[PDB]
Design a protein around this ligand. Structure first.
Ligand SMILES: CCCCCCCCCCO[C@@H]1O[C@H](CO)[C@@H](O[C@H]2O[C@@H](CO)[C@@H](O)[C@H](O)[C@@H]2O)[C@H](O)[C@H]1O
Ligand SMILES: CCCCCCCCOCCOCCOCCOCCO
Ligand SMILES: CCCCCCCCOCCOCCOCCOCCO
Ligand SMILES: CCCCCCCCOCCOCCOCCOCCO
Length: 387
């Protein structure tokens, strides 16, 4: 009578071939080329009856080495020993109790947060996870309030957890990551304004402002979004004084399966974008291999999408984008330039025994006069088994 009625168990399967090719010689390491199979166990109970409902969730991970050689092993699909050898496997299991009162919900334990201020990475074999507690509340129509504290994370290619730190810096760690968020949706569900504040204890404080609108016009579906991060050092300020403002925004137009979109992004201040180690960001140029977040980096993006439904081939989609950056500072030089060209093709079998089986290919070129030039390919096989 509930609890057992809204319960679900799924087994996510991801077969991944990853090949990042470094073009410049001597690159010391010529290549990251690995192949792995991941398993993602997610089991949720429903909630016990009563005004205060209890429930529990479980996240299980298993990554298996299918092919690797130490000369080419840092791909991020697998943990990597000091000898340079990939692990043959790694696993992880976290439980997550949950309470629900009215329209307010609390989860503690192993978490998969997808927050503008803390976006869990899923760019390899197995998801990044966090450890702590999340509150989510929507007692008011249109409004969603967020609060929580994280204490540790587990990176995508690790069984283990570790204290939090900031991407690209390390050295300074924290026990305590506290946030608060508010999100108001209006104009017949079209417009939305967001407000966020996060505090990585004794390292940084980060504000985030968000503005977005989405509206259909006959056959056109236009979308506009703009966000702003403002990050300063905080407390004892272990990384020292920090100073980044980071702007992002795009506009998107879609009609008859075709999508075109332009994006802009700019890093202001002595520091580039500051975020939690290994985490993703909602910045528009956070793309396949690079995210264009170096100090002072100004960048834009043009993106094209097509949904092959219209041709009579549903499940087939294609995407291409070009990202260009300038004025990046890298001790060696200011006016650092880079450009990345991504190509995404995906197919999902829509009928038959193999319904929902998915194959996706991601290809990227990156060239720069500061970053390492790369060519990257990933083959991704996907399927989700309900239990
Ligand atoms: C379909 C997929 C189902 C897979 C389920 C299989 C069960 C998983 C068995 C191993 O699980 C892991 O064991 C690691 C070794 O013990 C732990 O390291 C963790 O354990 C800590 C101590 O608890 C520390 O040693 C580390 O830093 C790290 O956090 C970790 O938390 C745990 O998840
Ligand atoms: C990050 C959460 C802490 C890890 C808790 C351990 C989970 C152990 O339970 C898993 C196995 O339980 C079997 C019952 O089903
Ligand atoms: C050297 C060129 C890189 C090889 C792949 C480029 C993109 C091919 O995809 C075309 C379909 O996408 C639309
Ligand atoms: C060397 C052998 C590795 C080949 C891996 C190719 O299979 C990738 C399947 O993903 C789709």
């Amino acid at each position: 009578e509930g609890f057992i009625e809204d319960a679900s168990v799924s087994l996510g399967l991801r077969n991944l071939y990853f090949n990042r090719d470094f073009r410049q010689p001597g690159a010391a390491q010529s290549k990251q080329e690995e192949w792995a199979q991941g398993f993602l166990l997610q089991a949720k109970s429903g909630y016990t009856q009563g005004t205060l409902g209890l429930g529990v969730e479980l996240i299980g991970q298993l990554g298996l080495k299918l092919d690797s050689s130490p000369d080419r092993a840092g791909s991020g699909l697998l943990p990597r020993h000091a000898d340079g050898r990939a692990a043959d496997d790694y696993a992880r299991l976290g439980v997550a109790p949950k309470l629900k009162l009215s329209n307010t919900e609390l989860k503690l334990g192993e978490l998969l947060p997808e927050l503008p201020i803390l976006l869990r990475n899923d760019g390899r074999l197995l998801p990044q996870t966090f450890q702590g507690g999340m509150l989510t509340s929507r007692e008011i129509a249109g409004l969603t309030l967020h609060g929580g504290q994280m204490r540790s994370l587990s990176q995508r290619n690790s069984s283990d957890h570790q204290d939090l730190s900031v991407d690209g810096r390390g050295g300074a760690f924290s026990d305590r990551f506290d946030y608060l968020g508010a999100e108001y949706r209006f104009n017949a569900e079209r417009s939305q304004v967001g407000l966020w504040q996060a505090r990585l204890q004794d390292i940084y404080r980060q504000d985030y402002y968000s503005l977005s609108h989405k509206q259909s016009f006959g056959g056109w579906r236009l979308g506009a979004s703009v966000g702003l991060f403002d990050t300063r050092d905080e407390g004892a300020a272990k990384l020292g004084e920090l100073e980044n403002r980071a702007l992002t925004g795009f506009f998107s137009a879609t009609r008859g399966g075709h999508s075109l979109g332009a994006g802009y992004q700019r890093m202001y201040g002595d520091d580039g974008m500051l975020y939690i180690a290994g985490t993703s960001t909602p910045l528009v140029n956070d793309i396949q291999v690079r995210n264009f977040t170096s100090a002072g980096e100004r960048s834009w993006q043009l993106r094209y999408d097509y949904d092959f439904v219209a041709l009579g081939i549903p499940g087939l989609t294609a995407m291409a984008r070009y990202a260009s950056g300038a004025h990046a500072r890298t001790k060696a030089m200011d006016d650092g330039r880079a450009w990345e060209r991504d190509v995404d093709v995906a197919y999902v079998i829509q009928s038959g025994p193999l319904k929902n089986l998915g194959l996706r290919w991601r290809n990227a070129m990156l060239r720069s006069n500061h970053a390492a030039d790369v060519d990257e390919n990933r083959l991704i096989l996907s399927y989700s088994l309900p239990l």
